A paper describes a structure:
Recently, the nitroreductase NfnB from Sphingopyxis sp. strain HMH exhibited metabolic activity for dinitroaniline herbicides including butralin and pendimethalin, triggering the initial steps of their degradation and detoxification. The homodimer NfnB is a member of the PnbA subgroup of the nitroreductase family. Each monomer displays a central α + β fold for the core domain, with a protruding middle region and an extended C-terminal region. The protruding middle region of Val75–Tyr129 represents a structural extension that is a common feature to members of the PnbA subgroup and functions as an opening wall connecting the coenzyme FMN-binding site to the surface, therefore serving as a substrate binding site.
Next, we determined the crystal structures of the two single mutants, Y88A and Y88F. Their structures were found to be nearly identical to the wildtype NfnB, with RMSD values of 0.38 Å for 428 Cα atoms in Y88A and 0.39 Å for 433 Cα atoms in Y88F. In the Y88F structure, the side chains of Phe88 and Arg100 are well ordered, at positions nearly identical to those of the wildtype NfnB. Compared with the wildtype NfnB, the side chain of Arg100 had been displaced by ∼4 Å toward the side chain of Asp97 near the entrance and was found within a ∼3-Å hydrogen-bonding distance from Asp97. Except for these displacements, no other residues at the entrance exhibited any noticeable conformational changes. Therefore, the possible hydrogen bond between Tyr88 and Arg100 identified in the wildtype NfnB is not crucial for maintaining their side-chain conformations or for NfnB activity. Compared with the wildtype NfnB, the smaller side chain in Y88A and Y88F mutants exhibited a wider opening to the coenzyme FMN. The specific activity of the Y88F mutant against butralin was 97% of the wildtype enzyme, and it showed significantly enhanced activities toward pendimethalin (90%), oryzalin (47%), and isopropalin (14%) compared with the wildtype NfnB for butralin. In particular, Y88F exhibited higher efficiency toward butralin and pendimethalin, with a lower Km value than the wildtype NfnB, but Y88A was more competent than Y88F toward oryzalin and isopropalin, mainly because of its lower Km value. Therefore, even the absence of the side-chain hydroxyl group in the Y88F mutant unexpectedly caused significant changes of many enzymatic properties, without compromising its activity.
Residue numbers in the entry:
A (entry chain A): 9 to 231
B (entry chain B): 9 to 114, 120 to 231
Write the structure that this text describes.
């Protein structure tokens, strides 16, 4: 399977089968992901990988904050820019309507759409959850480094018949997550990555995902 | 060429041939690179791609900043973290001196000079975004950028990501015709690798996974 294909066939998967992931596969995937580039070869990404009931502990501990409502939020950072303007603001809800479409939840059936969202905190039923973090000394370019490593991981997964879903939602409770995991407050939680076998006849995993056209992305000069 | 192979054979290339780059190829590459993920599918990345005489225009303007010594610097942001501790810096010098070893330099600005020539690449990509975007969105840009770099390799092209242009983000933003609504993250030199230049063949170190991955619940 080519890089193009893996890239074409990577999507955020929101339905995993109850099927385990070979730790040997993961370790091998990470060895190659480490070939990701980084400014100054700093390689600032750090990963805690949890499964079973270390992973169940996290879910429960965070679930205990979720029922607190907005009161229980412990944001590591601003997931989206406050006052995100209307260009980007459309892309966010644009896919939202594409994906709730796939499950059957009415457009302003607010109850049901929230119900699908909290599945986030089950890692959509993935057996393994990856927590990507780094030192609080790292700046935005180093966060870009982490993207590069993260995207590598997702492509290798696809290549080896596995799937994933990137999740910033856990940053809503960074401290709780960091606590359960045992990282200190020198560390900052960036994102989670639910890892597992995609349920490829779950409809939540088959609706076509939109991207904007290149005219909104790419400027050409000197040609 | 598989994704594993593509990752394995992507390196920062610092010697490009004069071989021109098919714009049709680049365009196709970007179309599929756009499939990279982004929090909320913001796809916050934007790119200005230059070759020819606008690309020479950018270089000339930055060189004018270079001759200024420290005065000509216009940092978009801070490339490496103030008070980066020497544990992490150890990685930088490990690879840095391995790379200065291959060229013979130890005097070193001559090599650093070559940066702003894009190591002789015919095409230079400038990745930027709105000043409103936060660090998660910068991670998004990373995901797109790594996508682009893997595709170059798969298609027989090569690249070098360059934060050095951020040393003059403002001058560069001017040449590109960008506003101060935008901030420059990085450059990406694009072209065919001069594949028997030795600076393109020395083995690049990575740390072991025991410094990287913690396993729990297994
Ligand atoms: C950093 C990051 C965080 C994400 N967090 C979540 C998340 O918390 N919940 C979720 O459902 N999807 C999350 N996603 C998935 C994105 O919505 C998805 O990448 C985008 O809509 C494109 O869809 P696709 O990846 O399936 O092509 C995240 C993606 C990224 C890059
Ligand atoms: C965001 C970013 C910016 C970079 N900027 C430069 C640069 O300005 N000059 C340079 O020689 N290398 C630059 N690099 C190359 C890194 O030094 C390189 O990725 C790492 O040192 C060596 O790994 P590699 O050759 O396998 O890519 C950059 C890499 C990244 C990810």
């Amino acid at each position: 399977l080519s890089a193009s294909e893996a890239l074409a066939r990577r999507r955020s998967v929101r339905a995993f089968t109850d099927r385990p992931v070979d730790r040997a596969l993961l370790a091998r995937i990470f060895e190659i992901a480490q070939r990701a580039p980084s400014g100054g070869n700093l390689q600032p990404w750090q990963a805690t990988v949890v499964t079973g009931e270390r992973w169940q502990a996290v879910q429960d501990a965070v679930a205990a904050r979720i029922v607190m409502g907005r009161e229980g939020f412990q944001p590591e950072y601003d997931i989206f820019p406050r006052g995100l303007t209307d260009p980007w603001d459309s892309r966010r809800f644009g896919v939202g309507e594409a994906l709730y479409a796939s499950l059957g939840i009415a457009r302003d059936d607010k109850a049901g759409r929230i119900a699908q969202f909290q599945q986030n905190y089950r890692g959509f039923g993935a057996p393994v959850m990856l927590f990507l973090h780094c030192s609080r000394i790292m700046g935005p370019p180093q966060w870009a480094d982490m993207g590069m490593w993260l995207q590598s991981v997702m492509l290798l997964l696809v290549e080896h018949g596995l799937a994933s879903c990137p999740q910033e939602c856990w940053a809503m409770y960074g401290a709780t997550v960091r606590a359960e995991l045992g990282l200190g407050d020198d560390q900052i939680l960036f994102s989670g990555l639910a890892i597992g076998h995609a349920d490829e006849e779950a409809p939540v995993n088959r609706w076509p995902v939109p991207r904007v056209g290149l005219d909104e992305v790419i400027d050409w000069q000197g040609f």
